[PDB]
Amino acid sequence: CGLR
Amino acid sequence: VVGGTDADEGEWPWQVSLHALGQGHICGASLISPNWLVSAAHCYIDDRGFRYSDPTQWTAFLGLHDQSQRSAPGVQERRLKRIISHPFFNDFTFDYDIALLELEKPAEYSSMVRPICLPDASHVFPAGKAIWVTGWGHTQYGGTGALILQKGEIRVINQTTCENLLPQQITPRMMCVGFLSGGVDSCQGDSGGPLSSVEADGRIFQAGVVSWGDGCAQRNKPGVYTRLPLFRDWIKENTGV
Ligand SMILES: N=C(N)c1ccc(Oc2cc(Oc3ccc(C(=N)N)cc3)cc(C(=O)N[C@H]3CC[C@H](N)CC3)c2)cc1
């Protein structure tokens, strides 16, 4: 979760 | 978003666009798991011409960049099988403005489609902290939605300051984020979207949901957001996530  | 810039493609792979049948983009939402989104309860209220509360009236676009290219490689289209408005959502004050949307089929994770992290219930996004608001909403109050996803950098405002700027309107579920001088803010159409906060290893956690504001980007009128940590346990109880 939570990065490109 | 007022005062922001074009996002890079795939820069916010948890940002989702919600379209009501025949109407185009209405609200944002955030991807939290293969099966669930977070959004704002205020987006899903029936009115006399349209059952915005009826999951079958919606399409979610994941991995979307540009509203005029909804069928670009990487974009995923999904229907909803359920909308869960917070049971304590109040129409009038916008207290508890949060909703959980169940995708009809799971999202496929990709470089363009990825969940945002959720903060634990005891986490506090501190006053002064920089965070990001994103959306396809108006780029000026009374003004036109952005075609290209916008980003804007805003800061968490002290709760007392917030309450005092918006008397008899701020509850402990709400958080002011933005600038007392205005300039950068969310706006109509950004509703339901996430605040993205860069945390200690650079991973992005959801700090809030776009909820309301008096106009957009006015001096002494920061945007008001639903806090996330307060709802971690509600999200778990309702979704398994
Ligand atoms: N950061 C910003 N500047 C900002 C962020 C989000 C914005 O989006 C909306 C969207 C909105 O849209 C709605 C459409 C429709 C239905 C419905 N079906 N009844 C409800 C809400 C209303 C409002 C609005 O003004 N709400 C009030 C809530 C009570 C509060 N005490 C007074 C204000 C704001 C606008 C600005």
User: Cα dist. B1→B36, B61, B114, B138, B152 in Å?
Assistant: 24, 19, 22, 6, 7
The string of DSSP codes covering B71-127 is TSTT-EEE-EEEEEE-TT--TTT-TT--EEEEESSPPPP-SS--PPBPPPTT----T
H or E stretch covering B233: helix B232-239
Report how far residue B35's alpha carbon sits from residue B107's, in angstroms, rounded to the nearest whole number: 7
Residues of A in contact with B114 (CB under 8 A): 1-4
Strands B223-227 vs B80-85: parallel, antiparallel or unpaired:
unpaired
Among B13, B115, B117, whose Cβ lies nearest the Cβ of A4? B13
What is the separation of C-alpha B186 from the centre of its chain, rounded to a whole number of angstroms?
A: 10
In 3D, which of B133, B111, B128, B106 has the Cα closest to residue B223?
B133
User: By three-state DSSP, how is residue B232 classified?
Assistant: helix
In 3D, which of B126, B232, B136 has the Cα closest to residue B191?
B136
What are the sequence ranges of the domains in chain B?
A: 1-12+116-229, 13-115+230-241
Exposure pattern of B72-106 as b/e (b: 16+ CB <10 Å)? eebbbebebeebbbbeebeeeebbbbbbbbbbeee
Strands B24-31 vs B194-198: parallel, antiparallel or unpaired:
unpaired
Six-digit token pair at B25?
């983009």
CATH of B13-115+230-241, one of 2.80.10.50, 2.40.10.10, 3.40.50.1370, 2.40.440.10: 2.40.10.10
Is position B86 annotated as part of the catalytic site? Answer: no
CATH of B1-12+116-229, one of 2.40.30.10, 2.40.10.10, 3.30.565.10, 3.30.110.40: 2.40.10.10
Q: CA angle, corner B176, sides to B134 and B129, nearest 5?
A: 70
SS3 content of chain B, % helix, strand, coil (to 5): 10, 35, 55
Phi, psi of B83 (to 5 degrees): -120, 125
Phi, psi of B6 (to 5 degrees): -60, 130
Ligand 1: lining residues by beta carbon, under 6 Å: B 42, 45, 47, 52, 93-94, 169, 185-188, 190-191, 210, 212-213, 216, 223
Burial class (CB in 10 A: 0-12, 13-18, 19+), B41: buried
Among B10, B111, B203, whose Cβ lies nearest the Cβ of A2? B203
* Domains B1-12+116-229 and B13-115+230-241 are alike in CATH topology: yes
Query: A 1-4 residues with CB below 8 A of B?
Result: 1-4
